[PDB]
Amino acid sequence: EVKLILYHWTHSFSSQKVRLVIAEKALKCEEHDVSLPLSEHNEPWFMRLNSTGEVPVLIHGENIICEATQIIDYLEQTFLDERTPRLMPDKESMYYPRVQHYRELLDSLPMDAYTHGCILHPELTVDSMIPAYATTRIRSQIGHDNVKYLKKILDELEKVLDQVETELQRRNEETPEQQPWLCGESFTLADVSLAVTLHRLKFLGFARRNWGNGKRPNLETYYERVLKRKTFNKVLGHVNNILIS
Amino acid sequence: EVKLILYHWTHSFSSQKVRLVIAEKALKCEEHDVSLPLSEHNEPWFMRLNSTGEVPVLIHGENIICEATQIIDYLEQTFLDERTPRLMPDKESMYYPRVQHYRELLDSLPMDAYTHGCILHPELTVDSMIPAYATTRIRSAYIAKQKRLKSKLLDHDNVKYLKKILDELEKVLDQVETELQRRNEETPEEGQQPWLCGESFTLADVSLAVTLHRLKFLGFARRNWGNGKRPNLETYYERVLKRKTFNKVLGHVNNILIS
Ligand SMILES: O=C(O)CCCCCCCCCCCCCCC(=O)O
Numbered sequence: 409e410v411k412l413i414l415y416h417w418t419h420s421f422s423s424q425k426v427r428l429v430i431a432e433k434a435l436k437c438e439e440h441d442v443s444l445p446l447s448e449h450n451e452p453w454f455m456r457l458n459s460t461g462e463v464p465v466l467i468h469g470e471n472i473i474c475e476a477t478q479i480i481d482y483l484e485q486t487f488l489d490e491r492t493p494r495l496m497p498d499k500e501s502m503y504y505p506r507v508q509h510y511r512e513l514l515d516s517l518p519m520d521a522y523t524h525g526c527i528l529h530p531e532l533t534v535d536s537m538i539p540a541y542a543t544t545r546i547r548s549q550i551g552h553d554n555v556k557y558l559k560k561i562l563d564e565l566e567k568v569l570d571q572v573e574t575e576l577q578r579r580n581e582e583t584p585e586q587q588p589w590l591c592g593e594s595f596t597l598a599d600v601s602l603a604v605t606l607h608r609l610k611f612l613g614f615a616r617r618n619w620g621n622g623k624r625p626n627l628e629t630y631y632e633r634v635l636k637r638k639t640f641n642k643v644l645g646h647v648n649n650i651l652i653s
Numbered sequence: 654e655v656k657l658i659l660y661h662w663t664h665s666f667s668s669q670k671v672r673l674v675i676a677e678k679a680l681k682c683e684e685h686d687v688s689l690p691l692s693e694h695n696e697p698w699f700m701r702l703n704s705t706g707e708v709p710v711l712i713h714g715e716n717i718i719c720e721a722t723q724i725i726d727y728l729e730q731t732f733l734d735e736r737t738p739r740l741m742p743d744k745e746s747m748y749y750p751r752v753q754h755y756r757e758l759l760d761s762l763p764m765d766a767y768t769h770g771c772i773l774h775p776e777l778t779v780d781s782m783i784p785a786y787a788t789t790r791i792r793s794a795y796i797a798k799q800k801r802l803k804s805k806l807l808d809h810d811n812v813k814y815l816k817k818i819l820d821e822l823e824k825v826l827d828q829v830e831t832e833l834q835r836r837n838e839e840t841p842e843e844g845q846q847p848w849l850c851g852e853s854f855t856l857a858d859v860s861l862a863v864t865l866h867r868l869k870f871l872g873f874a875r876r877n878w879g880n881g882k883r884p885n886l887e888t889y890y891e892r893v894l895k896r897k898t899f900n901k902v903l904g905h906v907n908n909i910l911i912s
Contacts, residue, residue: 415712442715462717465710467660470687472707474719 412437414479416464419443419453421519421608422476423464424644428600429480431639433492445653454650455542458520477515480597495597507591510575510598513568514605518561525558526612532558533613537648562614569618569627572602576626590630595637603634604644611648657682659724661709664688664698666764667721668709669863669903674725676898677854678737690912699909700787702772703765722760725856740856752850755832755857758825759864763818770815771871777815778872782907819873826877826886829861833885849889854896862893863903870907 414430416423418441430437447456463475466482473482484496497503526533530543532555572590579588589599606627609615619628634640646652659675661668663686675682692701708720711727718727729741742748771778775788829849836847848858865886868874878887893899905911 415710415717417715440712442712442717444715460716463719465660465712465717465719467685467687467710470662470689471705472660472687472710472719474708474710474717 410469411467413440413467414438414464415440415442415467417441417443417453419457419647420464421604424604424607424647425476425600426464426466426479427643428604428640429483429495429597431643432495432595432600433483433487435483435487435492452650452653454538455545457523480600484597493595495595495600497592497594497596503592507596507598510572510590511596511601513571514598514601517565517568517605519605519608521558521561522565522609522612522614524553525562526614528553529555529558530613532562534616536613537611537650538613539650562617565614566618569624573624573627576630580626587633599634602630603637603640606631606634607644607648655714656712658685658712659683659709660685660687660712662686662688664702664906665709666768666863666867669866669906670721670859671709671711671724672902673859673863673899674728674740674856676902677740677859678728678732680728680732680737697909697912699783700790702768702783725859729856738853740854740859742851742853742855748851752855752857755829755849756855756860758828759857759860762822762825762864764864764867766815766818767822767868767871767873770811770819771873774812774815775872777812777819779875781872782870782909783872784909819876822868822873823877826883830883830886833889837885846892858893861889862896862899865890865893866903866907 412430412435414423414426414437416426416439420443427439430439443453443456446452447459464479466473466479468482468486471482471486473479480495484494497507526536527538527542527546530536530538530540575590579590582588586593589595590602591598606615609618610631615631618624619631657675657680659671659682661671661684665688672684675684688698691697709724711718711724713727713731716727716731718724729739742752771781771783772788772791775781775783775785832849836849836851840846845852848854849861850857865874868877869890874890877883878890
């Protein structure tokens with residue numbers, strides 16, 4: 409009788425975290441993807457990745473909530489039925505600080521700057537999933553964006569992923585052969601931030617410099633496991649496929 | 654073919670500005686009032702004024718826009734058909750500075766704090782349209798001294814705050830009264846009168862009209878106009894009540910008999 413309504417863009421980074429939370433909490437939601445296959449300039453989704461500074465919006469009865477973080481906090485606070493999974497420990501738990509620390513650390517990453525850098529300076533990527541012609545078109549209609557800045561924030565990204573790799577190492581040492589996620593046994597909001605972040609870095613071609621082939625092996629094992637998680641696959645299994653509008 | 658969709662609360666101050674803009678631009682819009690006649694605690698709308706910190710949202714094609722100011726800017730920038738009224742002068746107009754100045758001056762008013770203050774400190778109102786029982790519901794030996802004291806201090810601070818912003822509100826309305834005086838002096842007394850900034854109804858008039866109507870609802874009208882005080886403002890308020898768009902959109906929003 410009281411619908412959950414979400415208006416969103418399928419390929420928006422924000423929308424992906426919201427929809428993965430909806431799936432992990434097993435909620436029924438009427439989801440409206442308002443994006444078009446082709447823009448006014450007949451550009452496809454992969455050339456419009458931060459076209460605007462606009463947010464998804466949730467309508468739930470009387471409540472209208474904008475922005476992924478606020479929507480996700482609303483969802484965690486509202487759906488308290490016993491059979492609805494929680495994605496945060498209680499605020500008085502000693503585990504709350506760890507989950508909130510990693511959620512905030514990952515949500516602070518400038519994903520918009522990585523995407524413009526992938527397109528502007530593809531020489532800094534390996535196996536970018538964005539066609540090369542996107543690069544030559546954005547650089548033409550030009551003729552903040554500097555190589556200096558982008559190399560700086562890619563190194564800052566390395567320091568965040570070092571902290572994550574260390575945390576995942578502590579999980580491995582604690583755990584025999586039911587494997588834990590980033591912060592503990594439960595899949596949490598820090599895991600949706602991490603999983604959706606890694607999948608987008610993969611899309612941008614910033615996966616191989618940060619993990620794989622012996623580098624950050626715990627992170628690589630985490631990424632491979634996330635891809636198989638049924639909720640992640642059901643919600644995000646195609647969001648990296650440029651053949652699908 | 655491309656619908657305008659608005660989700661909003663009818664009695665929300667923000668929603669009122671957005672819906673008045675939609676009416677003044679003559680746009681077709683699918684409007685969803687998500688407010689309930691009765692809350693879980695069987696309270697009606699006039700006991701839930703700023704219940705939460707939430708905004709209206711406009712969906713238009715691929716665009717999702719939240720908050721009244723951003724929605725209104727989007728509407729002004731997007732609907733450019735020749736027959737669609739403009740509520741802002743062109744950015745190169747000699748009028749643009751004056752409309753933008755009054756729009757931002759009125760949009761800077763802390764309407765939420767006037768609402769909180771009307772309910773918590775009704776002794777500072779005259780002819781509040783909110784029943785007195787809404788006040789008594791919100792207000793509902795050893796360390797009983799401490800909390801008697803702690804509560805007395807926040808009460809002291811909260812009255813001080815409210816008196817401070819009511820004096821700031823007077824200075825805004827003084828500027829508006831002076832502006833409307835210039836309009837009167839410029840215009841022959843017989844015939845059609847301009848609005849706040851000139852002949853056309855603008856975004857500054859939207860902000861002013863909806864602000865005055867809410868001040869009336871809260872009982873902050875009699876200290877600010879009427880009985881010889883700010884007579885240009887009083888004439889403006891009585892005129893905007895008769896404007897067809899304002900009456901069609903907002904004619905009952907102050908009536909607590911209507912759910
Ligand atoms: O003029 C009305 O009361 C609204 C009628 C609805 C149709 C739209 C007319 C737009 C009017 C633009 C500004 C004109 C000011 C009229 C002021 C007055 O006559 O008191």
